Structures are given as structure tokens and as C-alpha cells.
């Protein structure tokens, strides 16, 4: 069911409310990412030009 402020899920209609849709997936990516081994590369920038 669509209860609005959005969207479809999540949720019903106001054209957009993408920032709420960026709540749902945000939980799904993060909590799992904690449980995964971190590999990292910290890339730095040398110039603006």
C-alpha cells in the first residue's frame, strides 16, 4: 500500500520524497557493511588545476 509522502514504497505520492527512499536502502547497506571486512584506499588530491 502507498501511504504517500513520496513514491510508491516508500511511500504513496508527492511525486518524489527521494530522501525517504534514501532511508530504507541506507539501513540495508550500512548494517551489513559493518559485518563485512573493511578494505580501504584513502585517495588524496594533489591540485585543483
Amino acid at each position: 500500500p502507498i501511504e504517500k509522502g513520496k513514491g510508491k514504497a516508500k511511500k504513496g505520492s508527492s511525486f518524489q520524497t527521494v530522501s525517504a527512499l534514501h532511508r530504507e536502502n541506507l539501513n540495508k547497506l550500512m548494517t551489513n557493511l559493518r559485518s563485512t571486512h573493511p578494505h580501504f584506499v584513502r585517495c588524496i588530491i594533489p591540485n585543483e588545476t
Binding site: 534514501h22 547497506l29 551489513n32 563485512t36 571486512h37 578494505h39 584513502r42 585517495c43 588530491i45 585543483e48
Partner: protein, 193 residues
Amino acid sequence: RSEAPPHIFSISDNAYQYMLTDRENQSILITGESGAGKTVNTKRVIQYFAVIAAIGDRSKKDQSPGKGTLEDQIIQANPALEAFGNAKTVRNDNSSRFGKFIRIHFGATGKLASADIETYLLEKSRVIFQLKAERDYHIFYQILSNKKPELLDMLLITNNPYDYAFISQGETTVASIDDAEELMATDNAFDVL
């Protein structure tokens, strides 16, 4: 790993060598600023996998394209996503105007299984009129220059340039690439998909 020093293949070497043995799920997180060549880097992570771990015939010295087609398709999808997703910003000619998360999958014994990729945001706002010196989504310029006189009719492109209204400022260039030949490459990448 002594012949395997501090170039991105190593971290990806050590991740693969590690993971296939321990069976716990893993990550590869690159941070940076505007044009911290992020996208160019991850393709290197993939270029370790796509040519090492998978069942690719190495025993001949050929430039390479020697299978397996999973590896070939996983590669091509990246340039494909770049053409559509990437535009250009004042700092970065290759501004991936979106975001993607990649869950690489591996099988029972050694080799590759697949990949689950989601997308965050996209700059749909820019399409009206871009600020300064930016370019709109790469896919456009490629279709304009490389397309033949036949497709030009059906597809309904202007013959002349500078007609297109959604392209603000003007026809801005990128240092060292064309617009035209990059089209034929990626279109074949679709056939390859």
C-alpha cells in the same frame, strides 16, 4: 607477495586470497575528494579479479581477450555505466554524476560467480542547464558524432551542431579523448552484454 607490492592489485590479491579461505563477507572502500580518480581505481580492483582468479586461459601471450566472458561482461558494464552516468564538472571531466555499490560474488571453488550493484543518486537536475564548463551525460555526445546518416533520420538528430538547447554554455571538450570513436566502442559493449 614480494613480487606483489603496493599497487591496487595487491589489496585485491590479499582480499581474494583471504576471503576464499575464510568464507566471511568483505569490502573495498575507496574515499577521496572531487576527482580522486575513484572510478578508475575500482576498475583496477576488478582488473585484478577479472584476470587472475577466474578461469581465463593465460598460457598464451595475447593482448589478452582470452575468456572468460563473465569477466568480459563485468568489465564492459563499467564503461557503459560511465557513458550514461558520468558527465563532467569544473574540476572533473569524468564526474560520475551518480553512485553505485558493488557486491562481487564468488563460487564454490575459486572463480567468479557474479555481482549485485545498486545506485544511490543521479543528477537529473542538470539536464535543463548546466553551470560552468560542465558537460551533460556522455552518452549524448557519443550518439551525436558517431551515428551514421541513416540512424540520423530515424533517431532525429540535428545535422548541424549548437542547435541542442539542453546543452548549456557550449560544446565543451575533454582533454585527450574524442566523442566519436568512444561511441562505437561502447555500442559494441552492448552487443557484448
